[PDB]
Structure formats: C-alpha cells, structure tokens
Amino acid sequence: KERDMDELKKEVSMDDHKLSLDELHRKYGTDLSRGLTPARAAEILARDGPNALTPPPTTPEWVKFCRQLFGGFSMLLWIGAILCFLAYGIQAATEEEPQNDNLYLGVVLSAVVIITGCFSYYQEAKSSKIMESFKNMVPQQALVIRNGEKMSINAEEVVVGDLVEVKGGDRIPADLRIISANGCKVDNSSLTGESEPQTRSPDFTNENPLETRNIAFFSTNCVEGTARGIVVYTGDRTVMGRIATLASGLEGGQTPIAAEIEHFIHIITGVAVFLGVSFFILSLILEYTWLEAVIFLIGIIVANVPEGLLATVTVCLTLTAKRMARKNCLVKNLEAVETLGSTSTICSDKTGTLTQNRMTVAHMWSDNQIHEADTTENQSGVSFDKTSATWLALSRIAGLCNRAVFQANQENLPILKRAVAGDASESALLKCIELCCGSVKEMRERYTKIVEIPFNSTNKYQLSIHKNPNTAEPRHLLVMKGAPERILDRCSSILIHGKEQPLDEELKDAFQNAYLELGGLGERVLGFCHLFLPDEQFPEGFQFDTDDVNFPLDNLCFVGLISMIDPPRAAVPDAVGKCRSAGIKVIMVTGDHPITAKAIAKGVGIISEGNETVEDIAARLNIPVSQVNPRDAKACVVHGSDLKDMTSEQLDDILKYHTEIVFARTSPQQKLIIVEGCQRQGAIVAVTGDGVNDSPASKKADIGVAMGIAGSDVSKQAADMILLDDNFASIVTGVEEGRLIFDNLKKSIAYTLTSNIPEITPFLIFIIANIPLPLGTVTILCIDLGTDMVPAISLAYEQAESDIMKRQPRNPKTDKLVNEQLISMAYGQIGMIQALGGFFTYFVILAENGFLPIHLLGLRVNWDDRWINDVEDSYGQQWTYEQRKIVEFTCHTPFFVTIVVVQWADLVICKTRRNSVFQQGMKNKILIFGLFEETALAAFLSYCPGMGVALRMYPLKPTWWFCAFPYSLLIFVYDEVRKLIIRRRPGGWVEKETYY
Amino acid sequence: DPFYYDYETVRNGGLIFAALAFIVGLIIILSK
Amino acid sequence: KKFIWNSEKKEFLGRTGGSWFKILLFYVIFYGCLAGIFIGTIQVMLLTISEFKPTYQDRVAPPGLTQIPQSQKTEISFRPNDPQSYESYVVSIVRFLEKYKDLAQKDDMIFEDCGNVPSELKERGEYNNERGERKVCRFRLEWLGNCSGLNDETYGYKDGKPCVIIKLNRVLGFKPKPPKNESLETYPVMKYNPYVLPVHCTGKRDEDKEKVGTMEYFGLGGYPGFPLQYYPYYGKLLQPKYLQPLMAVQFTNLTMDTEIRIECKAYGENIGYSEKDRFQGRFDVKIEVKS
Ligand SMILES: C[C@@H]1O[C@@H](O[C@H]2C[C@@H](O)[C@]3(CO)[C@H]4[C@H](O)C[C@]5(C)[C@@H](C6=CC(=O)OC6)CC[C@]5(O)[C@@H]4CC[C@]3(O)C2)[C@H](O)[C@H](OC(=O)c2c3ccccc3cc3ccccc23)[C@H]1O
Ligand SMILES: *[C@@H]1O[C@H](CO)[C@@H](O[C@@H]2O[C@H](CO)[C@@H](O)[C@H](O)[C@H]2NC(C)=O)[C@H](O)[C@H]1NC(C)=O
Ligand SMILES: *[C@@H]1O[C@H](CO)[C@@H](O[C@@H]2O[C@H](CO)[C@@H](O)[C@H](O)[C@H]2NC(C)=O)[C@H](O)[C@H]1NC(C)=O
Ligand SMILES: CC(C)CCC[C@@H](C)[C@H]1CC[C@H]2[C@@H]3CC=C4C[C@@H](O)CC[C@]4(C)[C@H]3CC[C@]12C
Ligand SMILES: CC(C)CCC[C@@H](C)[C@H]1CC[C@H]2[C@@H]3CC=C4C[C@@H](O)CC[C@]4(C)[C@H]3CC[C@]12C
Ligand SMILES: CC(C)CCC[C@@H](C)[C@H]1CC[C@H]2[C@@H]3CC=C4C[C@@H](O)CC[C@]4(C)[C@H]3CC[C@]12C
Ligand SMILES: *[C@@H]1O[C@H](CO)[C@@H](O)[C@H](O)[C@H]1NC(C)=O
Ligand SMILES: [Mg+2]
Ligand SMILES: [Mg+2]
Ligand code: NA
C-alpha cells in the first residue's frame, strides 16, 4: 500500500500556521514563555521519534556485487554459459569419449561475468567510497526553553510543541511556528530556493506555509536577528523531511546507454537464433540426427555471442568516467557517464546552481555613471575605474557606515569565500571594499566612530559620525546609507568628480532612471551619502549624543547608489550558450521570485536577448495581456501559483509552443511534475541542482547533477552525478564526452561484431560442405579474448571526426547505438571478407600438404574418425589420425593469424566512421600498441614451445603469414572508398545504408 | 631428405619477432 | 502494433519494394565480386602446387602401420562359432583384398612381375611427366600363406586363430631403409636384413606377452616385412592402381575368452615413432576370441 504513501507526498504541504497565539498554545498545550516541563519533552521524545530524518536505506555490499553480476549484457553471457553446459551434458551422456570444448566455453563465460562484475563493482564502490569522505555531519545543538529555563540540547532531543530560540548564525532545528521576532531574517535557500534572506515575522502573511513569515523551516539558517517559536513539525514529518523521504522513494528509470545495450542484445540474439534455427533445420534436412542437430543449434547460437564485448564496453565506460573524475566531475553510476551526451532538455536550478547563492555588490553609481563591479566567484573579470574622488568618498561611506566585520579564522581564506558576521548586504559591501579598495581594517579604525544610528523599522536609515584624519581639514565626517527613496528626501547637495552641486532635476531624474535600471534588473539598490560637519558649529570636543537633532538630516551630499544581487557563476553563461549550441533546450526551474528569475535567465542565456514574454508584448503595446496571442511570444514565465491549476495537456502545450521557458515560484513537488512533463515528450532530461528541493527532481530525471559543496546532502545522494568543484562548465564537458564515447562505442562494437563472421563460417561450411574443421574453439578464444581485446579497448581513445558540440542531440527513437547499418557492415560486408580470407589460408595449408581443396569435400566423415589411420589425400598418400589432426590444428593456428591480419585493416577502418584514415590519422598510440601487441601475441601463441600440446596451436611456415595480406588490403580499400563516397556524396545511398 | 622441416629456426624467428614487436609497441605507448 | 509488415505507404518485412530491390542488387554484385576474388586467389594457389608432388611432406615423416580389420577401437572381439559375429571383419578383409586378385592384375601394360624374392628398390626415373605412366609391381594373394584370399580356402580367417595383415602407409617418394646388420636386439628375425623392411609383433606387458603363445608371419617369399622392390611411390596421378606390399600375421596359440594387447612395431632407420600417435611406426590391437 506504498502507492498511497507516495501519492500523499507528491502533494504540496498543508498547515495550521494561521492561528492566534492562544489557539496555538491551546492546540499544543505549551507555555509561550516557559515551554514545557522536561517530563513532557521526554514523554514525546520516547513517543514519536527523535528530531532527525530516518537514515537512508542501507545498501549491503553483497547486494550491489550481485547487481554487477547481472544486468543485460552479463545476462546474455549467463544464458550463453547455461547453453554451453547444456550442450556439454547432452554430448556427455549421449556419445562416446565426449569432448570438453563446450565445458571449457561455459567456464569461460562464467569467468567473463565474474571478472566484469569484480571490476565494475570496484569502480562503483570506489565512487561511493570517495563519496563517504564528504559526509562531514557536525552535530548541532539547539537552544530550547523548557520549564522556564534556557538549555542547549542536541537537535535530536527536540520534540513537538516546545519553545525554541534561535540566534543569527544558528540553524533552525525543526519546523517552528514563530511567536516573537526581533528583526529576524532566515535563509530558505536550500529548501524553497529563495535567494535573498527572507525575514520571519510572528504575524501570518500568506496562505502558503512556505511563503509566510510565521514559519521557520528544517535545515534553514537564521541569518540575522533573534526569534522564538513553537515546534510544529519534527523528524521525518517536517517539510524537508517529506521532501527527502519522497526523494529516496522514487524511481530511477532506465538510462539511455542501458536501453541501447538492451536493443543491441535484441539484434545480437535475433540474428543468433535465426542462424541457429535455420541451420538446425538445415542439418536435420541433411543427415544429422536430433542429438547432433541440437548441438548444432546450441553451437550456432552460442557462437554468435560477443564474449569479449562486455569487458570492452565496460572499459570504454570506465575510461570516459576516468576523464570525468579527472575534472572533479564524479559519477556514482558508471553508465551515467554517457547520459549527458544524449540529453536534449536540461532543467536547471537558479539559486546555488545557475547562481553563486551569495549577495554580491553588482553595480555602483558615481558621476551619474553606472560602474559594473566584478562579480565572478574567483575574481577574473573587468575591474572598474578606481581613481576618481567620487569613488574615494563612496568607498569610505560603505567601508565605515556598515555593521559588518570579518571573524577570527578569516585570514588565509580569500576575500570572497571567507565568512563575514552580520547582514548579507553589509557582507557584500565589506567584501567589495576589501577587494577593490585595499583593506577595511585600517580604513575603519582610521575614522574613529563617535555616535551611530542603526537601521530603523520605518524609514530604514543607518548613519554614523566619525573623526577626520585628513591632513588638511579637521571637520567631522558624517555618513549615512539607506533606501534611495529615504535618502532622496534627505539630500540637497550632490558629489561630482570631487566638488558639490545642487539637486537639479537634470541630473536628479538621471539618478531616478539609474535607480529603476539597476532595480528593474532584479537587483537590490542602496543609496550612500555623506557630509562634512562644520567644526565651528560642532567642535572637536562636542559630543553628539544620540537623542536630538545633532546632525543635519537634509542638505547632505549624495555620492551614489550601490546595487547588489547573487551573481551567476563564472563559466555559467558560456556553458549555457554551449548547451544551446548543441541543441539542448535550457529550462530554468526555481522557486525564487519571478522578477529575479527572469533577469538571471536573460543574464545566463535561457532567455535570449530580444525574445519577449507574453507579458512583454502587452507592455510594449500598452494593451491588456489577455489580448496578445501566445504564439507571438517565444519565451514565457510560468508562475508557481498558476502552475498549481494546470493539467497535463496545458503543460505539454507550454513546452511545445514556447522555446525559452522559466518556471518561477515552483515547489519541489512541482519541480518533479515539470521533469515528468519534459519526459512525456520523450526527450532525455538532466536536472542540475543543489538544494533539497532538487532531490525529487534530480532523482526522477534521466540524470541528476548536484553541486559538490554548495549542494545539500539529500539532493547530492538522490542525484546521479556530482560536481566536486561546482564548475557548471563540467556539464558542457559531460555532454561532450557522452556523445564522444557514444560514437566510440559504436566503432568498438562494430569491431567486435565484425570478427563473428569468420568465427562462425568455418563451422557453418563444416556442416554443409563436410570439410575438416577450419577454425578451432580455443583459437576463437585467443581471438575474441586474446588479441582483439587491446585493439577494441584502443578504439575508445578515438577523437571527434567533426565538431560533436555542433550537431543536435541524438534522437532516441532514431539514432540507435547499434542500428541496422552496423549489422550490414560487420556481419554483411567486412566480416564476410575476413571469413573468405580465413578459408583461403585454410585451403592453402591443406592443398600444399597434399589435400587439394576439391578433394576436401565429404572428407570430414573419415577425417574426424579416430581409428582410420589410412586417409587418402589427393596424391594417394595415407595419413594417420594424429598426422592429419596435427595438420588440422596447425590449420587452426593460421586461421587465427589470418583473423589478426584482417583485423589490422578492420581496426583502421573502424577507427573512422566518415573521415578518411589520411584525414583522421594514426595518432592513436593505444591503437598502434594494439596492433603491435596483437601481432606479437598471435605470433607467440604459434611459436612458443609447448603450444601444440597445451592449446593445440602449432608453429606456422612463414608463407602462411602472407595468405591473409590481400584480404586485409582489400578490406581497407573498400571501406576507404566507402567513406570517400560518404564524404563527396552526403545524400543517401552510401550514407543511409552503410554509415552506422 | 624432404621429410624434414627446420621447425626450430622458424619457431625461434617467430619468438624473436613476437619479442621485438612487443617491446617496440611498449616504446610506442611510452612517448616520453 | 507489430504490423510493420506492410502499410499503405509500402514496406515489406521492414522496408519498401524499391528498397528491397536496391539492397538485393547490391548484395548480389558485392557477393559476386567476393566470389570472383576468392576464386581468383584460390586459382593462383592452385598454380603454386604441382600435379606430381605435394609441396610439403614433413607432416608424414614417420609412416604409419595400419591393418585390414579397421575395428572401431582396434579390438577384435567375435565368436569362433557365430558366423555373423565376425562378419564385419571378413567383409573388410575381402573388400581390401578385392583389388589384389589375379584377375584384377591382368594388364601387362601397367603391371610388372617383380619377382618371387625381395630385391632392391625400383626407381622409375624422375617424378616428372616426361615419362609415361609408370608400372606397378604385382603382388598376388598367394604371398600371404594361410591368410590368402579366395584362392583355395575362403577360410574367412576366423574358425579359431585369426589373421591380421599389416600395411605400410603409402608415401610418395619414400624410400624405406631397414636397420643395419648391426641390429640392436630386434627379436628373432630372418637374415634377409637388406631387401625387406622388418615388422615384428609382440605383447605389451608381462601379461599380454604370456597370453599370446605363437605367432606366424607371412610375406613375400616368407619374410616378415615389406620388399624394397615396391618402393618408392610416384603418386596416384602417375601410378594409379598401385599395390603397396602386404604382410600377414596369424596368432595361433591365443588364450580364448581373454582380451590381450598386441603391438606390431615396424623397425627401420626411416621409420619413426611417437608417444602421442600409437600408429606412427608401431601398431596396436586388442584381440579377444571369446567362445
Ligand atoms: C557431426 C559431429 O562432428 C564431430 O563433432 C563436432 C560437434 C561437437 O562434437 C564439437 C565438440 O564436441 C563442437 C561443439 O559442439 C561446438 C563448438 C564449440 C562450436 C563453437 C561454439 C563457440 O562458441 O565457438 C565455437 C563450433 C564447433 C565447436 O568448436 C566444436 C568442434 C569439435 C566438435 O567435436 C565438432 C564428431 O565427429 C561427432 O561424432 C562424435 O562425436 C562421435 C559419436 C557421436 C555419436 C555417437 C557415437 C559417436 C562415436 C564417436 C567415436 C569416435 C569419435 C567421435 C564419435 C559428429 O557427430
Ligand atoms: C597352413 O595351414 C595348414 C593346415 O591347413 C598347415 O598344414 C599343417 O602343417 C603341419 C606342420 O606345421 C603338419 O603337421 C600338418 O599335417 C599340416 N596339415 C595339413 C592339413 O596340411 C600349414 O603348416 C600352415 N602353414 C603355415 C605356414 O603355418
Ligand atoms: C599352446 O598353448 C597351450 C596353453 O594354452 C600350451 O599347452 C599347455 O602347457 C601347460 C604347461 O606349460 C599345461 O599346463 C597345459 O595343460 C597345456 N594346455 C594344453 C591345452 O595343452 C601349449 O604348449 C602351446 N603350444 C605351442 C605350440 O605353443
Ligand atoms: C585493388 C586495390 C589494392 C586498389 C589499391 C588502390 C589504393 C592502394 C590507392 C588508390 C588511391 C590512392 C590514394 C590517393 C590519395 C591519397 C591522399 C594523399 O595525401 C596520400 C596518398 C593517398 C592516401 C593514396 C594512397 C593509395 C591509394 C588509396
Ligand atoms: C592489381 C593487384 C594489386 C592484385 C594483387 C594480387 C596479389 C596481391 C595476390 C594474387 C595471388 C595471391 C597469392 C596466391 C598464392 C600465394 C602462396 C601462399 O603460400 C601464400 C599466399 C600467396 C602469396 C598469395 C598472396 C596475395 C597474391 C599475390
Ligand atoms: C602491412 C604491413 C605494414 C604489416 C607489417 C608487419 C608484417 C610485415 C609482419 C607482421 C607478422 C610478420 C611475420 C611474423 C612471423 C613470422 C615467422 C618468423 O619466424 C619469420 C617471419 C614471419 C613470416 C613474419 C613476416 C613479416 C610479417 C607478416
Ligand atoms: C649380417 O651378418 C651375418 C653374420 O653375423 C651374415 O651372415 C650376413 O650375411 C650379414 N648380412 C649383411 C647384409 O651384411
Ligand atoms: Mg538551490
Ligand atoms: Mg567471438
Ligand atoms: Na536517476
């Protein structure tokens, strides 16, 4: 009955916050100033559970090891091993002196699955191992008022309905119901995505518990001020608790690479069983009994299974995941390394993902001129002009008149990432002055503060007077900051290049348009002014006690505005542009305010400059918004309030007709609904986030991307890829590698699938033409799992043939990893030539040793006989059993060598899918070593002492090594003219039939 | 007699070829 | 939902008609070229070998030693009474010796009377075709006494004391070289050491050697071996209807109702052996005359 449990969690939360203080204390039974007796606290603590989310569901290591031993590819190898032991049991119980070929093959298939499981498991375990080294869960004790006294207890010992006090800096323990605040501002960024610190007031403000200010939330941090509140929700019943529990209990889906592997096996076994069955009937039609024909069916089906393609595909995926871990882009799931490339719609988060989630001084005003400050996370941008007197005055107004200072250990840390004590706005100002104006320590103590006035509840203004250390004037320096509407009313003089001027409207209106420019840009602006107090009316001995009008409120000298906002990360805009370049639809999904979300969207690239929303057109025409046709609006902003009242068809139309979409004020549950709406179209989805609200979105997405440091633990675990460096450009690297390894996997698969034809055709014509066996079993093992392993592994190292970040995302219903064109190439054209080359070397060996090829027909009848030691060749010679068997095995060895020789050309042509080898080039050193090792190993297997005894591989006469050369050269020339017609003629024949 | 083949010389040459091609390939993947 | 068979917009088994013809035409031309290439190279391969000699003969260095009753496991188990029990043996002996009858060797243009006494080798020039079809020395069934074919007693060789003839693996240009007069302990044998390839049978261990009482050999003129006057072989092309020498072996005093192992080892300098191939040079048999 867990379906209903998950459905009651996909719904946005309800509450009882809108209650009078008396109704609340009556419902919960709690003293508003004394809390409750510790007795009641322990009685609830041992009643419903400690205030902590239930730990994640532990995953034993034997379970995931058994997981790696299964899947889809390892399962095909399992059914192959089963068929091998079935054939061996049949052959054993029914005929005399049965052979151990099939048994050898079954144990080989079992070993293949075990080895693949051991290393794939070691890799996934290594990812989780280095992931556990990031859980730095430091216990945090809460301040609870019980029985009329203040005590600091563990966060888990907190219960429902008891007074809890929080101080600026402390973390909100459970979900509280504020009862009394003192200018308290909390941080709802990790939960509701609200960037700027939202204040918390005891009065109920909004019907939505998330938007209202009378509710403190789990995992939120009280930025500034102090407040009180009654615990309404505790443990897993909390807001972020229901979100995390929903995240763990969601479906992961089927990755694109996995679906491609499954469809690949569909074609492999399709042709495998077609061959096995048609040849089973063919063998019965010839002469072989049901006992023999059953072994033929099993042999042909089992022979058509790429035994080594499992290890090659695994190493391929592991190699690309290695490159991901090199750039601090760790993937938890191995196949998750491919999903980025196949993505065609990225749903991103604003706060903490698209942005830096930190107040930063954005723009400044001076000389009626806007100066943009550098807002990059690592300070690698344009520096404004810092040589004017207006700046030397404004910087002192900000560095002095501000309640912001660095803490103790803030020494070795950079100027931005260091911790600042106080308001977020004052922190941004302190960092900007400490960064672009030397230092604020000696600059603040240089002007000894006399009397200050903090921020006011009404007409919010902050002023202070300081002594003047200049060597030319002893007049007192008074400074004040505040909202521009509060400072314009108290100003008459204006600073410009060092001198003053009146409040003429020619430049005052120019100040108003600048205020609306920085404000309309989604930023928060402040005004800074100062004035020289006359030392004749207020001497150096007079003390301006903060009581009456000791300072002139008006007639001040305005220097300039200073705006601020959370800026996007450094490579975020460029990366968004790269994703749009690759044809990936970028859709912003955030719970922040739309006025800021739209500005960040236009600033990063989600909303292209020039495109207009459905509201922008109504504003440009001065007409109601209900009149404009939505088809004339490319982009659109969708509010969460309106999203709650939407159907499936409506969301489908929102995504179908609008190319640039921005979902604002959306709850985490709505984030999940949006991801589902994107998946309904049938496109690959990637969710990039950091907060707990991104957990149900990162889980249900085809691939989730969490920020490694600025992210929350729940969304980091529910994701499929972690960015340990928070460099969002890693998303671009990922979408590039995902396409790169996709094409390289195609090449490597066509390579392993090409060798199947010359591996099976010997047995096929052995059944048909009744000729001696041309190719042996152990030799086939030496090809699939011996030589070819290094070339197939090297095929992963191939680079881009054209620009992959230029082509559009692959269509999942069209561009299959193994389409019908690859089968027409490997099984149809190249493998066919390789099979003919093997048969040529075969007939050469037998014809030179006395058995003419025409004479080899119907010869296996007496050839395989172990007692007819007088088998006439074409010259009348009598061959014993072991003599002719020595020839057959020393005929299997060159067939194997022939395979390596034709694999040289097959590897060189598979390295390039469209380009010419002359164009791409043998710059792949792993491939060069692949051919050298392949050839040296093949020669060693034939000439090592004791191989005709152990592996029954006998030495070769040197002329055998040249029997395969013309076939390899032919393969190379044919595929080269193929890629040449593909280049010159990109229309359809060579392209839609062979280009795979 | 034509019923004899110097298999030891061919075998020795094949093993020397296998040794040289492998050490050369190792030099190939060690570009320094 | 799986009716991709056809549609009103033309598809059969997956693709259209015009597409099926294009692909089929391509595959026919492609595979046709592949066939012509394989045939041309196989023809060059045929041009690198001759018709009178195999280009390599080292894989048949030690000639084999076969027998007439090609048993399923080199075992001779039958009943001295039941005629159908030993039918499989006699059938193969008669068919083997069917080409040695006096009527089969009647043409004097292809047969040559070697002689009643084993003589030196008979080399008929070189192996080229400059000379005509060489002659083959005759070998009448009378040479194998008490084990002859259908001459006077079609005994079937099985009424107790069976017969098992041995044959030397026919090899082109092979010149048998018997051991020197300095015979390194070769088990009582006649002094006709220079013009006959000796072959001596024996048990295998202390048990088999005791169960096998007496053995009687039969050959050309009474020698247990192969005469050198019948070698070397000049291939089937130049010497068709060639008759390699034969030599019979009869086991008179056997222990009935007991399976005993016999090893007929052929001796000589040009006769090699092998621990892996029990037929190269030597020859084994498991006789059991169960009554
Ligand atoms: C037509 C058969 O041909 C022969 O065997 C074939 C088939 C199979 O037996 C093979 C192994 O065992 C098959 C194997 O199955 C499949 C393979 C592994 C397959 C591959 C799968 C893959 O993934 O890569 C390669 C390709 C072929 C293969 O590599 C091997 C190759 C060796 C085989 O030996 C070939 C035998 O002559 C058989 O006869 C007798 O065995 C026989 C008797 C049988 C019945 C009753 C009485 C008998 C008495 C006898 C007395 C003395 C001697 C034999 C007796 C014939 O019936
Ligand atoms: C071939 O078989 C005949 C029997 O048909 C053997 O003839 C006997 O020979 C012994 C001497 O060894 C005489 O004592 C008998 O009187 C003979 N019997 C008959 C009926 O002739 C003959 O010896 C055998 N030949 C060989 C070479 O063993
Ligand atoms: C043939 O073999 C038999 C054994 O089957 C030999 O005769 C036996 O001789 C032993 C003494 O050594 C006696 O104990 C047996 O009773 C004898 N058996 C028979 C049936 O006579 C015989 O000597 C052998 N003959 C030849 C010529 O080798
Ligand atoms: C039946 C088969 C063997 C025909 C063989 C024809 C091949 C070997 C010939 C046909 C055209 C030739 C190519 C013509 C163009 C180029 C580009 C140049 O920058 C390097 C040489 C290169 C790469 C030549 C290599 C050899 C080549 C590919
Ligand atoms: C127009 C040109 C390029 C066609 C080239 C055809 C050549 C490469 C073909 C024609 C006949 C072939 C040869 C046929 C006979 C032999 C002898 C054997 O023991 C090794 C293979 C070997 C040595 C083949 C090598 C390739 C070969 C020489
Ligand atoms: C197409 C070109 C570049 C490939 C270069 C590698 C060729 C020339 C090499 C690869 C394997 C080599 C063979 C390796 C093994 C043997 C056995 C040895 O006892 C004699 C040499 C001989 C017969 C070599 C002849 C040359 C050969 C065919
Ligand atoms: C071998 O030696 C014996 C005497 O030891 C002799 O009678 C015989 O003629 C010799 N044969 C040859 C071919 O030398
Ligand atoms: Mg966030
Ligand atoms: Mg294979
Ligand atoms: Na997932």
Tab-separated table of C-alpha atoms in Angstrom, chain A residues 96 820 824 828-829 832-833 836 839-840 843-844 847-850 852-855 865 867-870 872-883 886-887 890 952 954-955 957 959 967 970 974 989 993, chain C residues 15 19 22-23 26-27 30-31 34 37-38 41-42 45-46 49-62 64 66 70-74 167-172 233 235-236 244 276-277 279-280:
chain	number	residue	atom	x	y	z
A	96	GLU	CA	31.485	-41.875	-26.738
A	820	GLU	CA	20.714	-1.913	-38.992
A	824	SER	CA	25.104	-4.595	-42.743
A	828	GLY	CA	27.443	-8.317	-44.021
A	829	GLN	CA	30.492	-6.828	-45.713
A	832	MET	CA	32.395	-11.710	-44.928
A	833	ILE	CA	35.758	-10.727	-46.430
A	836	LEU	CA	36.892	-15.676	-47.089
A	839	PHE	CA	39.127	-20.059	-45.835
A	840	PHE	CA	41.846	-19.074	-48.303
A	843	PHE	CA	42.816	-24.248	-48.427
A	844	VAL	CA	46.422	-23.133	-48.910
A	847	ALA	CA	46.493	-28.093	-50.633
A	848	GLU	CA	50.217	-27.632	-50.003
A	849	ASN	CA	50.340	-30.568	-47.556
A	850	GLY	CA	48.662	-32.918	-50.059
A	852	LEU	CA	43.640	-30.439	-52.731
A	853	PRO	CA	40.603	-28.234	-51.955
A	854	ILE	CA	38.333	-30.115	-54.377
A	855	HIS	CA	39.293	-33.313	-52.509
A	865	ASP	CA	37.390	-40.712	-37.243
A	867	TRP	CA	40.877	-45.030	-35.956
A	868	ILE	CA	41.005	-44.751	-39.766
A	869	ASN	CA	44.766	-44.179	-39.946
A	870	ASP	CA	44.873	-44.502	-43.773
A	872	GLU	CA	43.927	-40.885	-48.780
A	873	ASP	CA	44.796	-37.317	-49.786
A	874	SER	CA	44.925	-36.104	-53.388
A	875	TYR	CA	48.365	-37.638	-54.087
A	876	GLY	CA	47.453	-41.111	-52.818
A	877	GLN	CA	49.319	-40.720	-49.516
A	878	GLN	CA	47.992	-42.383	-46.354
A	879	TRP	CA	47.547	-40.104	-43.328
A	880	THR	CA	47.210	-41.414	-39.772
A	881	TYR	CA	44.824	-39.859	-37.256
A	882	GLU	CA	47.305	-37.707	-35.335
A	883	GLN	CA	49.189	-36.681	-38.502
A	886	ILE	CA	48.284	-32.070	-36.476
A	887	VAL	CA	47.591	-30.555	-39.885
A	890	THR	CA	48.293	-26.248	-37.476
A	952	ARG	CA	46.998	-27.372	-29.760
A	954	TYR	CA	51.294	-25.466	-33.819
A	955	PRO	CA	54.010	-23.319	-35.427
A	957	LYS	CA	55.531	-21.944	-42.020
A	959	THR	CA	54.425	-18.194	-46.100
A	967	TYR	CA	42.164	-9.672	-47.971
A	970	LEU	CA	41.015	-5.240	-49.900
A	974	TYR	CA	36.778	-0.968	-49.855
A	989	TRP	CA	22.995	5.628	-50.675
A	993	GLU	CA	22.856	2.108	-45.929
C	15	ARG	CA	11.421	-1.799	-45.921
C	19	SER	CA	14.482	-0.583	-51.233
C	22	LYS	CA	18.305	-1.892	-54.309
C	23	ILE	CA	19.749	-3.814	-51.347
C	26	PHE	CA	23.896	-4.521	-54.179
C	27	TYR	CA	24.376	-7.735	-52.194
C	30	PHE	CA	29.039	-7.398	-53.790
C	31	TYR	CA	28.970	-11.131	-53.066
C	34	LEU	CA	33.721	-11.559	-53.384
C	37	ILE	CA	38.102	-12.705	-55.850
C	38	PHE	CA	38.187	-15.844	-53.699
C	41	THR	CA	43.212	-16.221	-55.436
C	42	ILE	CA	42.405	-19.911	-54.994
C	45	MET	CA	47.081	-21.063	-55.094
C	46	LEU	CA	46.435	-23.958	-57.473
C	49	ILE	CA	51.485	-26.505	-56.463
C	50	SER	CA	52.360	-29.269	-58.936
C	51	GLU	CA	50.439	-32.388	-60.005
C	52	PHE	CA	53.189	-34.967	-59.384
C	53	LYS	CA	54.367	-33.949	-55.910
C	54	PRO	CA	52.987	-32.284	-52.770
C	55	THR	CA	54.941	-29.156	-51.943
C	56	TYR	CA	55.431	-30.283	-48.314
C	57	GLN	CA	55.925	-33.785	-46.913
C	58	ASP	CA	57.278	-33.226	-43.394
C	59	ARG	CA	53.921	-33.913	-41.683
C	60	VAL	CA	54.070	-37.573	-42.789
C	61	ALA	CA	57.719	-38.138	-41.757
C	62	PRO	CA	57.145	-41.397	-39.798
C	64	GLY	CA	52.028	-45.387	-40.235
C	66	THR	CA	47.644	-49.958	-40.461
C	70	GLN	CA	39.616	-51.415	-39.263
C	71	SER	CA	37.981	-52.028	-35.892
C	72	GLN	CA	36.037	-49.343	-34.028
C	73	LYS	CA	38.632	-49.438	-31.202
C	74	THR	CA	41.390	-51.628	-32.767
C	167	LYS	CA	50.260	-52.421	-44.337
C	168	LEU	CA	52.820	-49.616	-44.603
C	169	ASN	CA	51.420	-46.121	-45.108
C	170	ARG	CA	51.820	-45.274	-48.781
C	171	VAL	CA	54.060	-42.187	-49.014
C	172	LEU	CA	55.251	-40.526	-52.224
C	233	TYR	CA	55.581	-44.352	-54.613
C	235	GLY	CA	51.689	-40.530	-56.651
C	236	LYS	CA	48.173	-41.542	-57.667
C	244	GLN	CA	51.629	-51.426	-51.803
C	276	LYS	CA	51.301	-39.397	-28.965
C	277	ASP	CA	50.399	-41.298	-32.168
C	279	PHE	CA	50.160	-45.669	-35.196
C	280	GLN	CA	53.316	-43.869	-36.410
